Every structure is written in structure tokens, then in C-alpha cells.
Amino acid sequence: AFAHFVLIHTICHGAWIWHKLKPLLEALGHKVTALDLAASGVDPRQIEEIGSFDEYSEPLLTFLEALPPGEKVILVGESCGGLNIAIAADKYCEKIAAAVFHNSVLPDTEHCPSYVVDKLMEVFPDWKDTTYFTYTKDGKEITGLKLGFTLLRENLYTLCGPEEYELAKMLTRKGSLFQNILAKRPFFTKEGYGSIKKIYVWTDQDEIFLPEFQLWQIENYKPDKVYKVEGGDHKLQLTKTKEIAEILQEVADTYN
Amino acid sequence: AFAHFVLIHTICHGAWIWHKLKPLLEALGHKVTALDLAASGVDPRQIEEIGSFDEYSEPLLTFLEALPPGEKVILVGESCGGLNIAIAADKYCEKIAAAVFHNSVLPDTEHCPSYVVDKLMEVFPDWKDTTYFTYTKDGKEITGLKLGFTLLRENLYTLCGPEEYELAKMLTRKGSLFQNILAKRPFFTKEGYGSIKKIYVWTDQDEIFLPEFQLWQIENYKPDKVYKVEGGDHKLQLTKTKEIAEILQEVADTYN
């Protein structure tokens, strides 16, 4: 079948990380939306005006609200994109055929929304040259971050070409995990997020979402389907684009 | 020699069009700055807050102001980047070793600053699906534009890969030529802009800055050096990146 894929970037990135996968999926006949989330890509807001991961997810929620009754999309999220998928499926589970997690966080319904992110910080505590700043929004002090260039080169874009890495240096923006607000956020629901089909895609070559973390997530909340891509690095949509397009063709053929 | 290249994008683009050339130049030992100009790339201003091509050029002027007495840069501009180079050389001709024009407008000192742009609109009057809007800034009605996707595919990125074209679709922003303000702008000076060494790089395969226009510019204001790259398309820094790096190595070796 042909599906409508909505591609969701991770924090500090934008729709541009999908510039290689999007043409491929369309060449297979699929419709692809690649959103900039708030204060990401060429979205005009700055991160200081955003007070939560729910506020951050506004372009996706507004997108899902705009879809006509009866059509469904496959949400594909990378790295912190998994949290935007949990927020959107709690409000629009009827519009979601399946969610694909691509080297992504996999929140559950049993522990606070920050749980998987707290576990990532234990497995991965050294963020090299990443800088931090704080700002206040709606009386909350938030810790923002700007990804360091050596962390981008070594851990996220390990095996990507120097020109792909260049785009990351040029285009990554200040973001936030909003970790302290995620903690106090109500849990993802069983009937919303819990009911979505979840396909987990990952590589053991990922240098930040290390195998210990990723296999830990698989055991904590079993995905409906798990696919392990051999080789690649953290940005599989850049180092293993064809393989991810094949996996996504197979997800379209199975879920609607 | 090694030089400091400052790479200047055209309107509606950002530093990201240089993501392929910048690694190459650095791999040859050069320093490279690739600026976002105002309301371009991931610069936070919107085009409605910009009232002229001089306001637009602010990141470049502030950059040139920050350089310590005695160091010099080679300015490399693409397409409307030629006008940012004329504005900057009228204020900082002492900081400029040479300016490279890359499929670029080549303003002169004899006619109003809009002259070459008025001649482009005569040679190239059909801008396909490009949209326009007007806004008012400092009592002037400006015509802004947003490049159409079929114009980007066919005329600007003709021969670029689908993934490079994808980045153009995802990242191009609303811009303005500020043509009516350019007309009333004082002429570029002979002692500033007129005294800069100008190297003109172009391809006859360019589908918007057609050979008639480009050869016309060469005859109107003779460049110090002219290089014609065989093949390629309008975005030579994407289709002929190595050839442009070689030409820029040779410009560094000759000018300082």
C-alpha cells in the first residue's frame, strides 16, 4: 500500500534531517509530511517562548487536527521524536495507523513521561561540548541546550559524510528537553498512546542511544515489531536511508 | 596560500547552500565563514522587519567590522550575493583581498544599484510558480517573494540531486530583492567597490542567469579574472563543488 508518513525530527533539529528519506518514500508512491516543530528548523519562534514538550509539539498536533475524518498517517519519529508521538497519540490515536520509533525514546504508560529520558541520562551522562542555559517561561526555569559540535561529529553523525555533518553544524538550533516539566506531566494513557501499534527501528552502532539503553527500552515496553538495521549510526535516515525506506514500505503494507 | 573565505548566500537561502563547499575548502587548509544574512537561514528575523538590501546585509557588515586590523578575507557571493559584496566593499574595501562572483549579479559604479537586476528581469521575466506579497517598512511598500518549487527544480537546481533539491524546498524562506529601494540607493563608489579585485565564475548551463545576461554583465563591467565552469547548473557550489574549490584555491594563491 501507499501511506501518508509524517516525519518528526528530534530536538534542536528540523525537517531538514529528512531531506534524504523524503524523496525516496515519495519515489515509492507515499505521501510524506516532514514538519518543523516549534522553534525548530526555519520555524520563527525561539525556544525561550516554549514552556513544555507539549507546546514544542504544536505543529504536529495542529497538523493532525487538520486531517479530514477517516484518513490515517504513520508517524515516524527519531531520537526525542518518540515523546512528540506519545503526546500526539493521546489526542489523535484515531488518526494514527502506526508509529515508527527510529533510534528513539519509547515512553510507556506505567511511569512518568520523563522516565525513559532519565534512563538515557544515566547511560549517557557526558554530553561533551554541549552548552546549557536557563530561561523562565510561565514561572518555570527550563534548561535549554545547544549541542556541541564534537558531540554532533562523534556521537550523532558518526558515520555521516562531512557535508551532512556540515548541515548539522549550520542548522542545529537551541532546544530543550523540558525534563523537569516532563516529570510533572500526566502519564501517557493506555487508551490513547498505549493503543497505537509501535514499530521499533534501531541500530546497535548508535553512539548516544547505546545498545544497553535501546535493549532496555525494548524490555521495558515491548514494541509490536522490532527491526534492527545493521551498520549505520544514530542518523539512520542519513546513513541507511534505503534500508529505512524498505522498512517503512513494509510498515505501510502491514498497518492502516 | 591559505585565505579566509566568507561565503555569502543569495536571497531566500542561507548558509546551508555552502554545506558541500565549506568542508572542501577547509580540507585544503582555508578558514571559511558561511553567514546567514538577515531573515535568512536560521536567522531569527522575518523579511517584513527588513527595509533594504543594506539592512539585509547586516550580518556581513558586522562580521567585517569584527575583523582585527590587518586581516583580509576573500568574499565569495552567489547569485544576488553580488549586491551584498558591493555594499560591504563600499564600507570595508581595506578588509577585502578579492571578491568572487559565482553565477552572480555584478553591479557597477556608473548606473544605479538596481541596474543589473533590472537587466535580469528583462532577460528572465517568467518566474513560474514564485509568489509575491507586499509589506510596509519605514513607509516603503516592498515586494517580497517566495520562490516557487517548480522554478527551484527547473531553473536553479536543474542538475542537483533530489536530496539537494529537497533541502531547497524545506529551507528556502520569504525574501525580497528590495528593487525599488535599490533604485533610489546611492551608487557604489569607485574608491570602495570599484577598487576591489573581482573574479567572475559562471557556467553557460545556468538556467536563470542565462548566458545572454552573464556575457552582458562581463561586457558592462569587465572583471579582473573570468572563469567559466563547464557543465553544472546555477548552483555550481552543489553540482561542481571540486571545480569551484580549485578556482578558489587559485584565487587565494593570487590575491591578498
Ligand SMILES: N[C@@H](Cc1c[nH]c[nH+]1)C(=O)O
Ligand atoms: N540531537 C539529538 C537529540 C537529543 C539530544 N539529546 C537527546 N536527544 C539526537 O539526534 O539524538
Ligand SMILES: N[C@@H](Cc1c[nH]c[nH+]1)C(=O)O
Ligand atoms: N534563489 C535565487 C536568488 C534570486 C532570485 N532572484 C534573483 N536571484 C537564486 O539562487 O538564483
